Amino acid sequence: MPAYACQRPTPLTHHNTGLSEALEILAEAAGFEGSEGRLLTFCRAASVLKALPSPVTTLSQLQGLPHFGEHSSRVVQELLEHGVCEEVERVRRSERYQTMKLFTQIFGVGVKTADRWYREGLRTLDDLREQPQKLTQQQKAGLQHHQDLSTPVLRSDVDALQQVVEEAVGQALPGATVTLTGGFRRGKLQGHDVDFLITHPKEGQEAGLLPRVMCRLQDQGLILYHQAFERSFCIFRLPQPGSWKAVRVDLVVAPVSQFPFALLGWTGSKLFQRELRRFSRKEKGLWLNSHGLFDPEQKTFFQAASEEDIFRHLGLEYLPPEQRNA
DNA sequence: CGGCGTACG
DNA sequence: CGTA
DNA sequence: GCCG
Ligand SMILES: Nc1ncnc2c1ncn2[C@@H]1O[C@H](COP(=O)(O)NP(=O)(O)OP(=O)(O)O)[C@@H](O)[C@H]1O
Ligand SMILES: [Cl-]
Ligand SMILES: [Cl-]
Ligand SMILES: [Cl-]
Ligand SMILES: [Mg+2]
Ligand SMILES: [Mg+2]
Ligand code: NA
């Protein structure tokens, strides 16, 4: 088992679901406390279990697995022995965890804002609605739409949204294309949002595109919330039988020269990309982002025509999106 | 011990 | 600060 | 919290 998540296939569904879920509770709680290092180790240990070919049934099967030391092994041991880990259950029922989860789930609220509100004594969404002076426009929208945004986006919803975006994109710039990215491209059947990547086959024609797209979607009455730009984090009005629901949609524009890097970056998973960028820098001495891959010795950028090119550049076996579910 | 992804709005 |  |  290699040490980086980008070195091994990780399927969406696997054989250690309960164990990985428990470790990811501890990772999430670490993040709520600002402990980024412990968050990473618990995320990585969870991801290792996702990549295994069969269930862990005995503690000895953790020997030699990367990112399993005393703490993560004890968590697994307790789950195997008793079906529950006391530390995990204590986190789950704690007021701190439940409120930080509730607050950081709001669009426009991160850990730092959630934590300040927690320390001020705030605990519920209605607590926030009662003091709207303390809210940004973005947070106001996130709170108004919170119930709809808490409902999973279905793969069956994605196709309708993509046609709508393609219509506006085609008027904004004929020939521009729309590619589904994010979790749905990795095979997920549900999501928290829909992520789209937009480009044009003629380098440079994509300049200034996203304002033109957003103006057209807004004119069609489809935009419940949005903020020159190349990323847009929106709330869309999605038709439903006899009504509609609010859905988060992310739009990103990239020039075609950067499209493989942007596709790779925006297809995720989040942990897969962090691990990939960590691997690139630490093992290969190359700097990776959603725009390119930089050699800081030669001061040159790698040209890539595909995701396959990028994996080859980095000396990694290619993983299709369905195996990037780290 | 230092390191832990990397951008844009 | 938020967001991907 | 774990790796190197
Ligand atoms: N913090 C991050 N660091 C690096 N890449 C990230 C980060 N957040 C998001 N991304 C990239 O943006 C993609 C879309 O982000 P999302 O926040 O939309 N997560 P996604 O994988 O789509 O699952 P859902 O919760 O939406 O169902 C991710 O899959 C990553 O490729
Ligand atoms: Cl470029
Ligand atoms: Cl590609
Ligand atoms: Cl980036
Ligand atoms: Mg998504
Ligand atoms: Mg998104
Ligand atoms: Na949030």
Can you describe what's shown?
The chain is α+β, with helices and mostly antiparallel strands and 326 residues long. The chain folds into four domains: 1-94, DNA polymerase, domain 1 (Orthogonal Bundle), CATH 1.10.150.110; 95-151, DNA polymerase, domain 1 (Orthogonal Bundle), CATH 1.10.150; 152-256, Beta Polymerase, domain 2, CATH 3.30.460.10; 257-325, Beta Polymerase, domain 3. The chain is built from 15 helices and ten strands. The strands form three sheets. Strands 2-4-7-6-5 form a five-stranded mixed β-sheet, with helices on both faces. It has a three-stranded antiparallel β-sheet with strand order 8-9-10. A two-stranded antiparallel sheet has the order 1-3. Strand 6 (231-240) and strand 7 (243-253) form a beta hairpin. The protein is globular and about 60 Å long. Residues 182-183, 188, 191-193, 195, 250, 265-270, 273-274 line the site of the ligand Nc1ncnc2c1ncn2[C@@H]1O[C@H](COP(=O)(O)NP(=O)(O)OP(=O)(O)O)[C@@H](O)[C@H]1O.
Number of distinct helices: 15
In sequence order, what are the helices and strands, one letter per element? Answer: HHHHHHHHHEHEHEEHEEEHHEEEH
Quote the distance from N terminus to C terminus: 14 Å
CATH class of the largest domain, anyone? Alpha Beta
CATH-assigned homologous superfamily of the largest domain: Beta Polymerase, domain 2
What is the CA-based Rg, rounded? Answer: 21 Å
The distinct ligands, each listed once, are: ligand ZAN, chloride ion, magnesium ion, sodium ion
Strand content: 5-15%
Number of domains as seen in the coordinates: 4
Number of E-state strands: 10
EC number: 2.7.7.7
Function: Gap-filling polymerase involved in repair of DNA double-strand breaks by non-homologous end joining (NHEJ). Participates in immunoglobulin (Ig) light chain gene rearrangement in V(D)J recombination.
Main location: nucleus
Family: Belongs to the DNA polymerase type-X family.
